[PDB]
Design an enzyme around this catalytic site. Structure first.
Site, PDB file in Angstrom:
ATOM      1  N   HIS A  14      -8.555 -10.835   4.611  1.00 54.91           N
ATOM      2  CA  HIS A  14      -8.833 -10.652   6.018  1.00 54.91           C
ATOM      3  C   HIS A  14      -7.680  -9.780   6.571  1.00 54.91           C
ATOM      4  CE1 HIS A  14      -8.703 -11.349  10.220  1.00 54.91           C
ATOM      5  NE2 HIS A  14      -9.999 -11.686  10.153  1.00 54.91           N
ATOM      6  N   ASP A  16      -5.918  -9.417   9.332  1.00 55.06           N
ATOM      7  CA  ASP A  16      -4.786 -10.089   9.973  1.00 55.06           C
ATOM      8  C   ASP A  16      -3.973 -10.833   8.917  1.00 55.06           C
ATOM      9  OD1 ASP A  16      -5.391  -9.358  12.664  1.00 55.06           O
ATOM     10  OD2 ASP A  16      -6.688 -11.129  12.923  1.00 55.06           O
ATOM     11  N   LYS A  17      -4.665 -11.517   7.987  1.00 56.76           N
ATOM     12  CA  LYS A  17      -3.949 -12.228   6.941  1.00 56.76           C
ATOM     13  C   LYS A  17      -3.219 -11.302   5.982  1.00 56.76           C
ATOM     14  CE  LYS A  17      -3.536 -16.510   7.841  1.00 56.76           C
ATOM     15  NZ  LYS A  17      -2.056 -16.250   7.803  1.00 56.76           N
ATOM     16  N   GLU A  42       6.990  -7.135  11.793  1.00 56.51           N
ATOM     17  CA  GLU A  42       5.563  -7.135  12.108  1.00 56.51           C
ATOM     18  C   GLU A  42       4.865  -6.133  11.174  1.00 56.51           C
ATOM     19  OE1 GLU A  42       5.268  -9.469  13.972  1.00 56.51           O
ATOM     20  OE2 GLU A  42       6.798  -9.395  15.572  1.00 56.51           O
ATOM     21  N   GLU A  55      12.556  -5.504  13.360  1.00 58.97           N
ATOM     22  CA  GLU A  55      14.007  -5.517  13.320  1.00 58.97           C
ATOM     23  C   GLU A  55      14.491  -6.349  12.157  1.00 58.97           C
ATOM     24  OE1 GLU A  55      12.411  -7.096  16.198  1.00 58.97           O
ATOM     25  OE2 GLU A  55      11.862  -5.051  16.796  1.00 58.97           O
ATOM     26  N   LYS A 166     -14.285 -14.844   5.920  1.00 59.69           N
ATOM     27  CA  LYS A 166     -14.096 -15.832   6.992  1.00 59.69           C
ATOM     28  C   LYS A 166     -15.026 -16.990   6.749  1.00 59.69           C
ATOM     29  CE  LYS A 166     -13.074 -14.401  11.167  1.00 59.69           C
ATOM     30  NZ  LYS A 166     -13.215 -13.779  12.534  1.00 59.69           N
ATOM     31  N   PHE A 235     -22.081  -6.681   5.056  1.00 59.93           N
ATOM     32  CA  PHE A 235     -20.620  -6.658   5.189  1.00 59.93           C
ATOM     33  C   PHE A 235     -20.034  -5.900   4.009  1.00 59.93           C
ATOM     34  CE2 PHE A 235     -17.016 -10.173   5.981  1.00 59.93           C
ATOM     35  CZ  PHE A 235     -16.032  -9.218   6.135  1.00 59.93           C
ATOM     36  N   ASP A 243     -11.735  -3.565  10.520  1.00 59.32           N
ATOM     37  CA  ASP A 243     -11.118  -4.217  11.666  1.00 59.32           C
ATOM     38  C   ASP A 243      -9.619  -4.151  11.554  1.00 59.32           C
ATOM     39  OD1 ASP A 243     -10.929  -6.012  13.920  1.00 59.32           O
ATOM     40  OD2 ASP A 243     -10.774  -7.739  12.574  1.00 59.32           O
ATOM     41  N   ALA A 244      -8.948  -3.568  12.544  1.00 54.15           N
ATOM     42  CA  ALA A 244      -7.494  -3.500  12.520  1.00 54.15           C
ATOM     43  C   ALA A 244      -6.872  -4.890  12.482  1.00 54.15           C
ATOM     44  CB  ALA A 244      -6.984  -2.777  13.756  1.00 54.15           C
ATOM     45  N   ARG A 249      -1.888 -12.973  14.304  1.00 53.74           N
ATOM     46  CA  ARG A 249      -3.180 -13.000  14.953  1.00 53.74           C
ATOM     47  C   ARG A 249      -4.109 -14.070  14.380  1.00 53.74           C
ATOM     48  NH1 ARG A 249      -4.816  -8.555  18.466  1.00 53.74           N
ATOM     49  NH2 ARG A 249      -6.917  -9.183  17.777  1.00 53.74           N
ATOM     50  N   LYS A 250      -3.543 -14.955  13.539  1.00 59.78           N
ATOM     51  CA  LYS A 250      -4.285 -16.074  12.948  1.00 59.78           C
ATOM     52  C   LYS A 250      -3.470 -17.356  13.087  1.00 59.78           C
ATOM     53  CE  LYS A 250      -8.271 -14.359  11.989  1.00 59.78           C
ATOM     54  NZ  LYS A 250      -7.990 -13.566  13.241  1.00 59.78           N
ATOM     55  N   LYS A 270       9.424 -13.796   9.891  1.00 63.88           N
ATOM     56  CA  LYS A 270      10.578 -14.297  10.643  1.00 63.88           C
ATOM     57  C   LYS A 270      11.434 -15.231   9.805  1.00 63.88           C
ATOM     58  CE  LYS A 270       7.968 -14.277  14.974  1.00 63.88           C
ATOM     59  NZ  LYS A 270       7.404 -15.126  15.988  1.00 63.88           N
ATOM     60  N   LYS A 274      14.375 -17.899  13.989  1.00 60.54           N
ATOM     61  CA  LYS A 274      13.271 -17.758  14.925  1.00 60.54           C
ATOM     62  C   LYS A 274      12.547 -19.116  14.926  1.00 60.54           C
ATOM     63  CE  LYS A 274      14.191 -13.266  14.125  1.00 60.54           C
ATOM     64  NZ  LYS A 274      15.483 -12.879  13.504  1.00 60.54           N
ATOM     65  N   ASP A 276      10.095 -20.157  16.482  1.00 55.02           N
ATOM     66  CA  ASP A 276       8.633 -20.123  16.409  1.00 55.02           C
ATOM     67  C   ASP A 276       8.162 -20.675  15.072  1.00 55.02           C
ATOM     68  OD1 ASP A 276       7.906 -18.918  18.870  1.00 55.02           O
ATOM     69  OD2 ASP A 276       8.013 -16.878  18.007  1.00 55.02           O
TER      70      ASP A 276
HETATM   71  C1  LIG Z   1     -16.062  -9.062  13.459  1.00 56.92           C
HETATM   72  S1  LIG Z   1     -14.416  -8.298  13.241  1.00 56.92           S
HETATM   73  C2  LIG Z   1     -13.800  -8.165  14.957  1.00 56.92           C
HETATM   74  C3  LIG Z   1     -14.576  -7.168  15.815  1.00 56.92           C
HETATM   75  C4  LIG Z   1     -14.402  -5.689  15.345  1.00 56.92           C
HETATM   76  N1  LIG Z   1     -12.996  -5.262  15.603  1.00 56.92           N
HETATM   77  C5  LIG Z   1     -15.402  -4.778  16.039  1.00 56.92           C
HETATM   78  O1  LIG Z   1     -15.029  -3.540  16.105  1.00 56.92           O
HETATM   79  O2  LIG Z   1     -16.465  -5.199  16.471  1.00 56.92           O
HETATM   80  C6  LIG Z   1     -13.380  -9.646  12.757  1.00 56.92           C
HETATM   81  C7  LIG Z   1     -13.416 -10.003  11.287  1.00 56.92           C
HETATM   82  O3  LIG Z   1     -14.785 -10.243  10.914  1.00 56.92           O
HETATM   83  C8  LIG Z   1     -14.978  -9.850   9.565  1.00 56.92           C
HETATM   84  N2  LIG Z   1     -16.004  -8.814   9.474  1.00 56.92           N
HETATM   85  C9  LIG Z   1     -15.859  -7.449   9.393  1.00 56.92           C
HETATM   86  N3  LIG Z   1     -16.991  -6.803   9.254  1.00 56.92           N
HETATM   87  C10 LIG Z   1     -17.941  -7.814   9.184  1.00 56.92           C
HETATM   88  C11 LIG Z   1     -19.337  -7.793   8.993  1.00 56.92           C
HETATM   89  N4  LIG Z   1     -20.052  -6.674   8.829  1.00 56.92           N
HETATM   90  N5  LIG Z   1     -19.987  -8.978   8.977  1.00 56.92           N
HETATM   91  C12 LIG Z   1     -19.282 -10.105   9.125  1.00 56.92           C
HETATM   92  N6  LIG Z   1     -17.966 -10.248   9.315  1.00 56.92           N
HETATM   93  C13 LIG Z   1     -17.350  -9.053   9.342  1.00 56.92           C
HETATM   94  C14 LIG Z   1     -13.617  -9.411   9.015  1.00 56.92           C
HETATM   95  O4  LIG Z   1     -12.975 -10.560   8.457  1.00 56.92           O
HETATM   96  C15 LIG Z   1     -12.941  -8.944  10.300  1.00 56.92           C
HETATM   97  O5  LIG Z   1     -11.516  -8.931  10.203  1.00 56.92           O
HETATM   98  C1  LIG Z   2      14.232 -12.838  21.180  1.00 55.60           C
HETATM   99  S1  LIG Z   2      12.986 -11.547  20.834  1.00 55.60           S
HETATM  100  C2  LIG Z   2      12.294 -12.071  19.226  1.00 55.60           C
HETATM  101  C3  LIG Z   2      13.283 -11.970  18.067  1.00 55.60           C
HETATM  102  C4  LIG Z   2      13.683 -10.500  17.727  1.00 55.60           C
HETATM  103  N1  LIG Z   2      12.497  -9.795  17.159  1.00 55.60           N
HETATM  104  C5  LIG Z   2      14.867 -10.466  16.775  1.00 55.60           C
HETATM  105  O1  LIG Z   2      14.947  -9.380  16.072  1.00 55.60           O
HETATM  106  O2  LIG Z   2      15.669 -11.385  16.710  1.00 55.60           O
HETATM  107  C6  LIG Z   2      11.596 -12.020  21.818  1.00 55.60           C
HETATM  108  C7  LIG Z   2      11.646 -11.592  23.269  1.00 55.60           C
HETATM  109  O3  LIG Z   2      12.873 -12.078  23.841  1.00 55.60           O
HETATM  110  C8  LIG Z   2      13.320 -11.168  24.833  1.00 55.60           C
HETATM  111  N2  LIG Z   2      14.647 -10.656  24.498  1.00 55.60           N
HETATM  112  C9  LIG Z   2      14.997  -9.478  23.882  1.00 55.60           C
HETATM  113  N3  LIG Z   2      16.291  -9.291  23.793  1.00 55.60           N
HETATM  114  C10 LIG Z   2      16.829 -10.393  24.443  1.00 55.60           C
HETATM  115  C11 LIG Z   2      18.157 -10.771  24.732  1.00 55.60           C
HETATM  116  N4  LIG Z   2      19.229 -10.048  24.390  1.00 55.60           N
HETATM  117  N5  LIG Z   2      18.349 -11.934  25.392  1.00 55.60           N
HETATM  118  C12 LIG Z   2      17.284 -12.659  25.752  1.00 55.60           C
HETATM  119  N6  LIG Z   2      15.989 -12.406  25.531  1.00 55.60           N
HETATM  120  C13 LIG Z   2      15.831 -11.252  24.860  1.00 55.60           C
HETATM  121  C14 LIG Z   2      12.257 -10.072  24.961  1.00 55.60           C
HETATM  122  O4  LIG Z   2      11.311 -10.487  25.948  1.00 55.60           O
HETATM  123  C15 LIG Z   2      11.668 -10.097  23.555  1.00 55.60           C
HETATM  124  O5  LIG Z   2      10.353  -9.539  23.496  1.00 55.60           O
HETATM  125 CL   LIG Z   3     -10.800 -11.902  13.093  1.00 56.89          CL
END
Ligand SMILES: C[S@@+](CC[C@H](N)C(=O)[O-])C[C@H]1O[C@@H](n2cnc3c(N)ncnc32)[C@H](O)[C@@H]1O
Ligand SMILES: C[S@@+](CC[C@H](N)C(=O)[O-])C[C@H]1O[C@@H](n2cnc3c(N)ncnc32)[C@H](O)[C@@H]1O
Ligand SMILES: [Cl-]
Ligand SMILES: CN(C)c1nc(=O)n(-c2cccnc2)c2cc(Cl)ccc12
Ligand SMILES: CN(C)c1nc(=O)n(-c2cccnc2)c2cc(Cl)ccc12
Ligand SMILES: [Cl-]
Lengths: 380, 380
Positions: A14, A16-17, A42, A55, A166, A235, A243-244, A249-250, A270, A274, A276
Site C-alpha cells: 500500500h 502509504d505503508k 518523511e 531532518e 487493503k 485493480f 495513489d500517492a 497516513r496510516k 522517528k 520524538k 509521538d
Molecule cells: C482508492 S485510493 C484513494 C483515492 C485515489 N487517490 C483517487 O485518486 O481516487 C486508496 C487506496 O486504495 C487502493 N486502490 C487503488 N486503486 C484501487 C482500485 N482500482 N480498486 C480498489 N482499491 C484501489 C490502494 O491501496 C490505494 O492506496
Molecule cells: C518539534 S518539530 C518535530 C521534530 C523535528 N522534525 C526534529 O527534527 O526534531 C514539530 C513542530 O514543532 C514546531 N517547532 C519547530 N521548531 C521548534 C522549536 N525550536 N521549538 C519549538 N517548537 C518547534 C513546529 O511547529 C514543527 O512543525
Molecule cells: Cl488509502
C-alpha cells in the site's frame, strides 16, 4: 447489547505503508551505526518516485539509494509490469540536519534520563482482553488477511497478486459491563492489486477460499456474512502509481483500528526522542500491563508532553467500566509503577535498537513480543 | 470524579497545516471551474519547496504555481528572513489523472445518488454539549490560542511573531453520568516561531498577557495553572525549514483533539467522493444533530464503506451513558433520519462548493455554521 465495529488494515505495498517502511528502514540504517541518531525522515511515493524529506543529525554514513531500493525490493515492487520497480525508480533526497533550535531545547547538554520531549503532543495506549495479544479482533483479522495475501503472493500460490492491498473487517459484538465479546464477522472487504490476465471470478473465489477461510475461524462466518471482494471490479494500476503515499497516513492501522483513541502523531521515521512514537509505545505497555495484571478488561491511557520538558504534563485513564477500581486509583497505580520521561522509556523499551522497519506493516502492537508487549509486573 | 484531558492545535504556518491549506486551495481552484472534479492532491513542504503529488481528473484549467504561491502568501511566509517565501520558493508538480481503474469502479456511468464510495474506510463523528458549538473545550481553546497569535501577528501588535505555532491545553474536568464538565485549565503550552531580536522574557510575558488572557476565561486560570511558554527556549528556525510537512498529518487537530475516535483518513485535497472527508463531515452532522436534538449529552458515531459501494457497510453509536435511549434505539433514529451514501451527503452538505481552504486550519468542526454544523431536525 449487540453492536457492530469496523477496522481496516493495508498491505506492505500500500503506498502509504511503503513510505512508513522506507522511513523506518532509514531510521534503522542510522541506528545500526549511531544509536543516538536524531531522525525525522518523511517519505513520499508517487509513480516512479521515492522522495525523502526531513531532518537527520547522525554520525552514520548511510547510502540512501541502497536503503530505499532494498526496502522496495523486500515489499515486492521489482518490475515495471507491477507499476513500480526498485531497480529503476527515482530516489530523491531533501534531508538536512536537525534544526539547532530544536536540538538545543531538547537534548543538547542534557543528561539522557532528563532529555526533554522532542515535541509537545498527546498519545494514547489501549488494550482489550478480547484476544490473548490484547488487541481488537477487528484489526487483528484485518492485518492477518493482508499478511495472508503477501504469503500467497510470495510462495507463488496466487501469482497474479501484487503488493498493494487493503482489507476491512466488521465484527458483531456483545458487551458485558464495558468488556466486548466477538460473536461473528458481519462484513469483510478485500481489495488487492492484480495482474492483467486473471478474471474477477477467479480472484473472488481465491479470496474467499484461500485467504478468508485460511485466516478467519469458521465459527465467525455464516450464511449472512457479507463479502465485498474486489468490489471496485478492477485493480491493475496500484502502488504509488494508483495513489500517492506519505509517511504517517496510516496511523489508525498502525494502532487500534478505531478503538481506543489517537493523539495524531505518526510513528515511522522517528527516533525515541520524538514522543509521538516512544510515548505511544510506553502507553501501550501501560495499558497492556493493566489488562494482563487483571486490573481491568479494557483500558485507555492518555499521556501528554511539552517540547523540552521531560516529565509528562498529564496522564489519564479510562477503564470503560471494566475495573472495580476507580480511574483515580488506576492512575495512582500507573504513577507508582511507570516513569514516562522519554529518557527512561528509551531504557525500559530498548528504543535505540534498529527493529523499527519490522513495526512498519501489520500494526505496531500485539505482535512479536517487542518490549512494549511484555507486561510489567505491577506493585500496589 | 476529577480527571485531566489534553488537546493540541497548530497555526496556519505549521508545516503540516501549510500542506493541508495548499491541498484545499488546489481543490477549491478546481471546484470553481468543474464542480465534478476528482481531486486527490497531496502536498509536501520542506525548505524552499512545495511539492504537489497525486491524482486529479478535471475540466478546470488551474495554474498550480499561482494557487500554491497565493496560499503561502495568505499564511504569511513572504520573506527569506521568515524561513520561507511564496515569491521565491520552488513549486514542483507530480500530478497525474485519477486511475481509470478507480474511476470505473467508483463513479463512471453511475447515477450521482448511487455513486460508490471512493475508497473503503471507517470514519467517526463526535459531539459534546460542554460548549455551545458541541466541541471539546480543550481543543476549542487550543485553536483560539493559535488564532490569537495569527491575529496579533497580522495586526502588527507582536511583530516578532512568525506563522508557525503550536498550542496545547490540559483541562481538569468533572463528570456526571458520562457528560463532562470543565472546571479549570491545568496546563497550557505555547510554542511560536519568532524573530532573532526578541528576548525570551518579552515573549513569555506577551504570551501570557496578550494571548492567553485574551482567550481563556479568567475563571479557568488560577495560582496552580502551569504555563509552558516557549519551552524549547528558541524557535527562530521554523515552518518547512524546521520540520518537513505533509498533507493529512494533523488529523486529530482537524477533528476532536483526542476525544471521540478517528478512522485514519485525511480530509484536505479530496473531493466529496472520497468518504474520508464527506462521511466524516456527515458523521459530525449526525452526532451534532443527536446532541442538539436533546437525545444525548455526548455521542460518537462510526460509519464504514467499501470502495465502489454506495451504502455504508456499518453504522454504530456510543452515547457514553448520556442518553436514556439505548444505543440500539439511537441507531434506529439515525437510520430513519439520515442517508449516508456519498451521493446523498454531497447534496445535503453542498460538498461541491469551493469552501474547503476555509476548513484547513483551526479544525473542520465547531466553526462558521458550515452545513455539517447545522443540526437536522429529527423525526422519531
Ligand atoms: C482508492 S485510493 C484513494 C483515492 C485515489 N487517490 C483517487 O485518486 O481516487 C486508496 C487506496 O486504495 C487502493 N486502490 C487503488 N486503486 C484501487 C482500485 N482500482 N480498486 C480498489 N482499491 C484501489 C490502494 O491501496 C490505494 O492506496
Ligand atoms: C518539534 S518539530 C518535530 C521534530 C523535528 N522534525 C526534529 O527534527 O526534531 C514539530 C513542530 O514543532 C514546531 N517547532 C519547530 N521548531 C521548534 C522549536 N525550536 N521549538 C519549538 N517548537 C518547534 C513546529 O511547529 C514543527 O512543525
Ligand atoms: Cl488509502
Ligand atoms: C462497548 N461499545 C458499545 C463500544 N465500545 C467502545 O470502546 N467504543 C469506542 C471506540 C472508540 C472510541 N470510543 C468508544 C464504541 C464506539 C462505537 Cl461507535 C460503538 C460502540 C463502542
Ligand atoms: C469521562 N471521561 C473520564 C473520559 N471521557 C472520554 O470520552 N474519554 C475518551 C476519550 C477518547 C476515547 N475514548 C474515551 C476519556 C479518556 C481518558 Cl484517557 C480519560 C477520561 C475520559
Ligand atoms: Cl508537528
Amino acid at each position: 447489547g449487540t453492536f457492530l465495529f469496523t477496522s481496516e488494515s493495508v498491505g506492505e505495498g500500500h503506498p502509504d505503508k511503503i513510505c512508513d517502511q522506507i522511513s523506518d528502514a532509514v531510521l534503522d540504517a542510522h541506528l545500526q551505526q549511531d544509536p543516538d541518531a536524531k531522525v525525522a525522515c518523511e517519505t513520499v511515493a508517487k509513480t516512479g518516485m521515492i522522495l525523502l524529506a526531513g531532518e537527520i543529525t547522525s554520525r552514520a554514513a548511510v547510502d540512501y539509494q541502497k536503503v530505499v531500493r532494498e526496502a522496495v525490493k523486500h515489499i515486492g515492487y521489482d518490475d515495471s509490469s507491477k507499476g513500480f520497480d526498485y531497480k529503476t525508480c527515482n530516489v530523491l533526497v531533501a534531508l538536512e540536519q536537525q534544526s539547532p533550535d530544536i536540538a538545543q531545547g531538547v537534548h543538547l547538554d542534557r543528561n539522557e534520563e532528563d532529555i526533554g520531549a522532542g515535541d509537545q503532543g498527546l498519545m494514547f495506549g489501549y488494550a482489550t482482553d478480547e484476544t490473548e495479544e490484547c488487541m481488537p479482533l477487528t484489526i487483528v483479522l484485518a492485518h492477518k488477511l493482508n499478511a495472508k495475501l503477501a504469503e500467497l503472493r510470495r510462495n507463488g500460490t496466487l501469482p497474479w497478486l501484487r503488493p498493494d492491498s487493503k482489507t476491512q473487517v466488521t465484527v458483531q459484538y456483545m458487551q458485558d459491563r464495558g468488556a466486548v465479546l466477538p460473536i461473528r464477522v458481519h462484513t469483510i472487504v478485500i481489495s488487492v492489486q492484480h495482474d492483467e490476465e486473471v478474471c474477477l471470478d477467479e480472484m473472488r473465489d481465491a479470496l474467499k477460499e484461500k485467504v478468508i477461510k485460511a485466516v478467519v475461524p469458521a465459527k465467525y462466518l455464516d450464511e449472512d456474512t457479507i463479502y465485498h471482494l474486489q468490489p471496485s471490479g478492477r485493480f491493475v494500476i496500484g502502488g504509488p502509481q494508483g495513489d500517492a503515499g506519505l509517511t504517517g497516513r496510516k496511523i489508525i492501522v498502525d494502532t487500534y483500528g478505531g478503538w481506543g483513541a489517537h493523539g495524531g502523531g505518526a510513528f515511522s521515521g522517528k527516533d525515541y526522542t520524538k514522543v509521538d512514537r516512544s510515548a505511544a509505545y510506553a502507553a501501550r505497555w501501560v495499558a497492556k500491563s493493566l489488562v494482563k495484571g487483571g486490573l481491568c478488561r479494557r483500558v485507555l491511557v492518555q499521556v501528554s508532553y511539552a517540547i523540552g520538558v521531560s516529565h509528562p504534563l498529564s496522564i489519564s485513564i479510562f477503564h470503560y467500566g471494566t475495573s472495580q477500581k476507580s480511574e483515580r486509583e488506576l492512575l495512582e497505580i500507573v504513577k507508582k509503577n511507570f516513569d514516562l520521561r522519554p529518557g527512561v522509556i528509551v531504557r525500559d523499551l530498548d528504543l535505540k535498537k534498529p527493529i523499527y522497519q519490522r513495526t512498519a506493516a501489520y500494526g505496531h502492537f500485539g505482535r512479536d513480543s517487542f518490549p512494549w508487549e511484555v507486561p510489567k509486573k505491577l506493585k500496589y
